[PDB]
Design an enzyme around this catalytic site. Structure first.
Site, PDB file in Angstrom:
ATOM      1  CG  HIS A  76      17.259  57.275  33.160  1.00 38.44           C
ATOM      2  ND1 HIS A  76      17.708  55.993  32.944  1.00 38.44           N
ATOM      3  CD2 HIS A  76      18.073  58.083  32.448  1.00 38.44           C
ATOM      4  CE1 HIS A  76      18.746  56.025  32.129  1.00 38.44           C
ATOM      5  NE2 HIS A  76      18.987  57.282  31.812  1.00 38.44           N
ATOM      6  CG  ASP A  88      25.431  50.753  24.498  1.00 38.66           C
ATOM      7  OD1 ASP A  88      24.628  50.419  23.606  1.00 38.66           O
ATOM      8  OD2 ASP A  88      25.063  51.186  25.609  1.00 38.66           O
ATOM      9  CD  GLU A 102      27.846  69.349   2.200  1.00 35.06           C
ATOM     10  OE1 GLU A 102      27.843  68.128   1.936  1.00 35.06           O
ATOM     11  OE2 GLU A 102      28.491  70.186   1.537  1.00 35.06           O
TER      12      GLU A 102
END
Ligand code: HEC
Ligand code: HEM
Ligand code: HEM
Ligand code: DY2
Lengths: 370, 65, 72, 32, 98, 237, 58
Positions: free
Chosen positions: A192, A219, A262
């Protein structure tokens, strides 16, 4: 007068053209907050001891009112939490956002901080692939000279993975996300100051727009679709990304056939199994991640995006294939066809990033008389 | 009592892949049987037959149950 | 940063309507579809071939992996 | 000049209820 | 021939399909902003429109007709004369320290 | 190895549930065949309520087996009839006695066996229903038998089932296949009792998500509609 | 006029009235949706659920 800070959510200048690829930054903000609530409610019924942990998951998945959904919104709430990254990163590399060095170097520090947290989190159910996963992967630090035999025993709290190894993961696991939440607000803070990037790589100060009606609802859409692909797995294929040997409790005297982490680590693991030299394998593993911090020092094209860099597009989507390969090789065993492939792909990963992709933009500059 | 499974296998054994996998299974059997002092066996030849038969049993068996 | 002094712009005009006064799905099939195919052909030859190459090494590596485990 | 400035046609995008320049939009705003 | 190859790469890139020129795309940078600041108002105010139009296209994920695309021979290098000046000034500042 | 075949199970459907009637039969199998040699630690007689047995029926079975419970006031421990809260009685006191009673081999637990073996219930039915003599050139040690559906094709699991190995209550013919079908249905309930309730939420979701996705997609292309339709011009002096 | 315009004039105009619709809608929606959803699931899985067979064992 907090809500001057909510101007980063309401009246924030943002460009106009940005497609779905940027939503994956926000979604982590949902997965993370989602995952914390779920894993918390798992803490209410989890036990960090070895004689009681594996059963504790059963207490959840059997006797608790809808305890079972929470386990699978949370486990697979980590898998989706890495589909989001790897696309959230690929944006940053393909659209050239890594010029925001202050964020990117923190983007790395979020990644590591996470991708160790899942490792710890995968132990807690205390099954075979949990235990044996942690047994193999901690020993890699033993390869380091003069330290490793001391450091590994320290992390274990002993001489092999046992009770005190488990209980501390549960505490290192159920804390770091609250540290990750900090670094995100930091990570945004440096963003920002600069405002986000667009597909073009061009300064968008002219065609900015607010954020409150436009990207918010975008969103909300992108978040909704995420909750689909999560809950589908929870409600239509929960054992998909799992590994069924995990549903046998830990037996340190009975090694499973296929040891592997995984799916979201496997490309790292394939790089390791490629190299026979143990220590040299390790520094490749850590370097496959940390290489992101070498990208901006290898920027060569006077452009930023890759919508306007044909050769880099072809190389970029080649890198993705090399990753997908390494994801596949790591999951598969080690034999002469797969050994050979796993070697070539790993070389491409370092070669393609360090050599070709820089070399491309140099060439692309030359065609444009630069 | 009759296990219907035996009937379903009996029909599936008549299928082309099974007869051909049966063939090599018979042929390897003649090999290892006629021979002596060897480690070779008809393991693989059997599994290829059974992968074919049981795949056919899959499509039919539960109709009876 | 904020609106108002981000940069300098001159002699530029914008026209816009109220969303309550226009369709949300104008030419959604009529015009949107060929844009996709146009958006597709513009890029597909750069995305496809490494993944096309992947599918082959996936199978060839898979079959050769199988054959390795069978026998002499 | 500024008087030479004129709006182009949006009628490709406008709702069908408001394509008639000669009618008052209010009657269907409640419905829109 | 290389000229034909330069031309094909230009159309392959596609920033002609958004009506942009080359120098409209260069990475925002300290040596560049200096050069941009030195532009005249006419040329500058044209740069802003070539950009703001293009962004309005990529939002809609559309492009312009072939009649408006930027031609290779018409690719004006309006910024390089001012930019090569700035980089020369920078090397003097560095060389002067040494 | 041998990839097992995939079957048309009744519950393979994305919305298909389990044959609760078959789960009833499957429990009778585990109880009369396997409960003597396999543990199932993570199930209770109460979980059977409302699924395959009712309250009273399961309660009756709780009172069939004796369970070690209660430090007596004298300071000892005794045996009582089990109750619903009690879990399935473990046949053996410890795994070493099992290895002792099965030639060093370990009967595994069966709470999660479906979800602890690649292929799932397809594997298991093919496993029981896959016994055969070994082929030529193959020979095994005493105690161990041949079965193609196992790594190395060598297990201690002697024939648990066959035609009329037991009897059912509903008058079903107890073919080896009929038996192995029902038991695997039971085990899929054991390893995933949420199965039948999983899909109902899976149904509620897709109907809602079938609605919210387009509606939200409208509000998006309602608010963004200003920008997809705006226009520009350039009027210098 | 149309129905949509009548709905707006009475309900979607005042945000107070607006919200009360949504709660009211949720209640009748919560009821209606659950009944219809279960009916489909049962119709697919007819004769497989406990209650569909429970009558035999009372
Ligand atoms: C006669 C005692 C006995 C009975 C009865 C029996 N089992 Fe077995 N079972 C064993 C033993 C002992 C093993 C260990 C196999 C090994 O160690 O390789 C075993 C192995 C298994 C396996 C394979 C484990 C693996 O990892 O491959 C399954 C599945 C199983 N048992 C379940 C069953 C099923 C299904 C039945 C029939 C419904 C059954 N048990 C009945 C003794 C028994
Ligand atoms: C932020 C990054 C996180 C990642 C990558 C992650 C990942 C994982 C994964 C993959 C598992 C395995 C679960 C399973 O296999 O069933 C796990 C377990 C667990 N997680 Fe998460 N997790 C994260 C955050 C959290 C948080 C914030 C909490 C609590 C607030 C939490 C609580 C737990 C617990 C208690 C377990 C063990 C219980 C169980 O697995 O059944 N985790 N974690
Ligand atoms: C917990 C992990 C993370 C959180 C909470 C998070 C959050 C965010 C959010 C909300 C944005 C704005 C949306 C966007 O620009 O896409 C963003 C931007 C960004 N993120 Fe992260 N992110 C995470 C992980 C990462 C990682 C792992 C990387 C790099 C390896 C990264 C690199 C970036 C960059 C470069 C930007 C700005 C790019 C641009 O604006 O063009 N982030 N982050
Ligand atoms: C233009 O790109 C940007 C630029 C800056 C951003 C930024 O500074 C933040 C903090 C975020 C963000 C981070 N976490 C979560 C959300 C969020 C959004 C909707 C929600 O609502 C619901 F529908 F429930 F998901 C819930 C959470 C947003 N997104 C940015 C996206």
């Amino acid at each position: 007068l907090m809500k001057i800070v909510n101007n980063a959510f309401i009246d924030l200048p943002a460009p106009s053209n940005i497609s779905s690829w940027w939503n994956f930054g926000s979604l982590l903000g949902i997965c993370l907050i989602l995952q914390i609530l779920t894993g918390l409610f798992l803490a209410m019924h989890y036990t960090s001891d070895t004689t009681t942990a594996f059963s504790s998951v059963t207490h959840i998945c059997r006797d608790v009112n809808y305890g079972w959904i929470i386990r699978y919104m949370h486990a697979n709430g980590a898998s989706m939490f890495f589909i989001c990254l790897y696309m959230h990163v690929g944006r940053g590399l393909y659209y050239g956002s890594y010029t925001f060095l202050e964020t990117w170097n923190i983007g790395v520090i979020l990644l590591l901080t996470v991708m160790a947290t899942a490792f710890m989190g995968y132990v807690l159910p205390w099954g075979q692939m949990s235990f044996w996963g942690a047994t193999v992967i901690t020993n890699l630090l033993s390869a380091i000279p003069y330290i490793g035999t001391n450091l590994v025993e320290w992390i274990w709290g002993g001489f092999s993975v046992d009770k005190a190894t488990l209980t501390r993961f549960f505490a290192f696991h159920f804390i770091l996300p609250f540290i990750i939440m900090a670094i995100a607000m930091v990570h945004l803070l440096f963003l920002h100051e600069t405002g986000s990037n667009n597909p073009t790589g061009i300064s968008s100060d002219v065609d900015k727009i607010p954020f409150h009606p436009y990207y918010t609802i975008k969103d909300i859409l992108g978040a909704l679709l995420l909750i689909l692909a999560l809950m589908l797995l929870v409600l239509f294929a929960p054992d998909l990304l799992g590994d069924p040997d995990n549903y046998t409790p830990a037996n340190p005297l009975n090694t499973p056939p296929h040891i592997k982490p995984e799916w979201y680590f496997l490309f790292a693991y394939a790089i390791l199994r490629s190299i026979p030299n143990k220590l040299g394998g390790v520094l490749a593993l850590a370097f496959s991640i940390l290489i992101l911090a070498l990208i901006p020092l290898l920027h060569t094209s006077k452009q930023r995006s890759m919508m306007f860099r044909p050769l880099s597009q072809c190389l970029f989507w080649a890198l993705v294939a090399d990753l997908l390969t390494l994801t596949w090789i790591g999951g598969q065993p080690v034999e002469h066809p797969y050994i050979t492939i796993g070697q070539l792909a790993s070389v491409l990963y370092f070669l393609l990033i360090l050599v070709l992709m820089p070399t491309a933009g140099t060439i692309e500059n030359k065609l444009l008389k630069w | 009592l009759v296990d219907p499974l035996t009937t379903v296998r009996e029909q599936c054994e008549q299928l082309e892949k099974c007869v051909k996998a049966r063939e090599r299974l018979e042929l390897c059997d003649e090999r290892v049987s006629s021979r002596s002092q060897t480690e070779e066996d008809c393991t693989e030849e059997l599994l290829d037959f059974l992968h074919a038969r049981d795949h056919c049993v899959a499509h039919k068996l539960f109709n009876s149950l | 940063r904020q609106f108002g002094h981000l940069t300098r712009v001159r002699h530029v005009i914008t026209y816009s309507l109220s969303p309550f006064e226009q369709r949300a799905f104008p030419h959604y099939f009529s015009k949107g579809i060929p844009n996709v195919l146009r958006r597709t052909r513009a890029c597909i030859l750069r995305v496809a071939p490494p993944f096309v190459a992947f599918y082959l090494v996936y199978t060839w590596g898979t079959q050769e992996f199988e054959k390795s485990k069978r026998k002499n | 000049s500024h008087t030479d400035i004129k709006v182009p046609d949006f009628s490709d995008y406008r709702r069908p209820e408001v394509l008639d320049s000669t009618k008052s939009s209010k009657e269907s705003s409640e419905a829109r | 021939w290389l000229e034909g190859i330069r031309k094909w790469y230009y159309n392959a890139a596609g920033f002609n399909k958004l009506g942009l020129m080359r120098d409209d795309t260069i990475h925002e940078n300290d040596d560049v902003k200096e050069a941009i600041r030195r532009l005249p108002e006419n040329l500058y105010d044209d740069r802003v429109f070539r950009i703001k139009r293009a962004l309005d296209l990529s939002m809609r994920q559309q492009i312009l007709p072939k009649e408006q695309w930027t031609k290779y021979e018409e690719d004006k290098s309006y910024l390089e004369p001012y930019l090569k000046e700035v980089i020369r000034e920078r090397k003097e500042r560095e060389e002067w320290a040494k | 190895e041998l990839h097992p075949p995939s079957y048309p199970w009744s519950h393979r459907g994305l919305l298909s549930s389990l044959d609760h009637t078959s789960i009833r039969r499957g429990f009778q199998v585990y109880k009369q065949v396997c409960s003597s040699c396999h543990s199932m630690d993570y199930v209770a007689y109460r979980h059977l309520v409302g699924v395959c047995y009712t309250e009273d029926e399961a309660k009756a079975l709780a009172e069939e087996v004796e369970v070690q419970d209660g430090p007596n006031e004298d300071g000892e421990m005794f045996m009582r009839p089990g109750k619903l809260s009690d879990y399935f009685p473990k046949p053996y006191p410890n795994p070493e006695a099992a290895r002792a009673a099965n030639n060093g081999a370990l009967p595994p637990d069966l709470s999660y066996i479906v979800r602890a073996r690649h292929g799932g219930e397809d594997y298991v039915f093919s496993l029981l229903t896959g016994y055969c003599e070994p082929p030529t050139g193959v020979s095994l040690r005493e105690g161990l038998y041949f079965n193609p559906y196992f790594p190395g094709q060598a297990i201690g699991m002697a024939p648990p089932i066959y035609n009329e190995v037991l009897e059912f209550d509903d008058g079903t013919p107890a073919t080896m296949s009929q038996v192995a079908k029902d038991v695997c249905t039971f085990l899929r309930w054991a390893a995933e009792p949420e199965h039948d309730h999983r899909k109902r939420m899976g149904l509620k979701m897709l109907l809602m998500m079938g609605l919210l996705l387009p509606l939200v997609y409208a509000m998006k292309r309602h608010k963004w509609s200003v920008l997809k339709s705006r226009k520009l011009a350039y009027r210098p002096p | 006029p149309t129905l949509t315009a009548r709905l707006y004039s009475l309900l979607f105009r005042r945000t107070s009235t607006f919200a009360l619709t949504i709660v009211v809608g949720a209640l009748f929606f919560e009821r209606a949706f659950d009944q219809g959803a279960d009916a489909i699931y049962e119709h697919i899985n007819e004769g497989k659920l406990w209650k569909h067979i429970k009558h035999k064992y009372e």
